Amino acid sequence: DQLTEEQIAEFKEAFSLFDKDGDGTITTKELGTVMRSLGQNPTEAELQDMINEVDADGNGTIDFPEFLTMMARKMKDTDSEEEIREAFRVFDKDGNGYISAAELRHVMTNLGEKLTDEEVDEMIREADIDGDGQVNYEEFVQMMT
Ligand SMILES: Clc1ccc(C(c2ccc(Cl)cc2)[n+]2ccn(C[C@H](OCc3ccc(Cl)cc3Cl)c3ccc(Cl)cc3Cl)c2)cc1
Ligand SMILES: [Ca+2]
Ligand SMILES: [Ca+2]
Ligand SMILES: [Ca+2]
Ligand SMILES: [Ca+2]
């Protein structure tokens, strides 16, 4: 089938979270910044190894079609569940088990991202299956699939 404009917009927003300077490519330095904000501490060589798996043309960076190719592979690492829980803990800064729009705003400002209130509210709505206005652990996990 064909992607909708909403699906293209969602892929574009996800790419922009890594592409901090907006030049259309994701570098090892930009990938490292995101991973550190989600509780990880990869070395530069490990970041290069991760990019190399996705980088098809071999120019050291990830472009939009390479990013989409990555998503279409449904690839996973051995400690995926631990990394997803670690990332979940980062967002839920008040320890109540729900990620609020305020807590998502906190992680985005720490990452150096500039997002409007409508963009933050749409990200919550995108993941909020039960409709309580916040993202619980199961919704945060389901979002990854
Ligand atoms: Cl905790 C977690 C688990 C899985 C993923 C997915 C994924 C899904 C959607 C999107 Cl928009 C980007 C990546 N996934 C697919 C491939 N890589 C490998 C790597 O994941 C790095 C990573 C690991 C752990 C954590 Cl906590 C965050 C990240 Cl970004 C990676 C991610 C983004 C780019 Cl641009 C390039 C690479 Cl190689 C991860 C992401 C986070
Ligand atoms: Ca970039
Ligand atoms: Ca490339
Ligand atoms: Ca919370
Ligand atoms: Ca919810």
Residue numbers in the entry: 2 to 146
Quoted passage from the original study:
CaM has two pairs of EF-hands (N-lobe and C-lobe) connected by a flexible linker.
Depending on the molar ratio of holo-CaM and CDZ, we obtained two crystal forms. The two crystal structures of holo-CaM:CDZ with one and two CDZ molecules are quite similar with a RMSD of only 1.4 Å over all Cα and exhibit compact and globular structures. CDZ-A and CDZ-B are bound to the same region of holo-CaM and are mostly localized in the N-lobe. Taken together, these analyses indicate that the holo-CaM:CDZ complex exhibits a similar conformation in solution and in the crystals and suggest that a single CDZ molecule is sufficient to induce an open-to-closed conformational reorientation of the two domains of holo-CaM. These results suggest that the part of CDZA, which remains solvent-exposed once interacting with the N-lobe of holo-CaM, likely forces the C-lobe to collapse by a hydrophobic effect, closing the two lobes of holo-CaM on themselves, with holo-CaM wrapping around CDZA. Overall, the CSPs are in agreement with the binding interface observed in the holo-CaM:CDZA complex and further indicate that CDZ binding affects distal regions in holo-CaM.
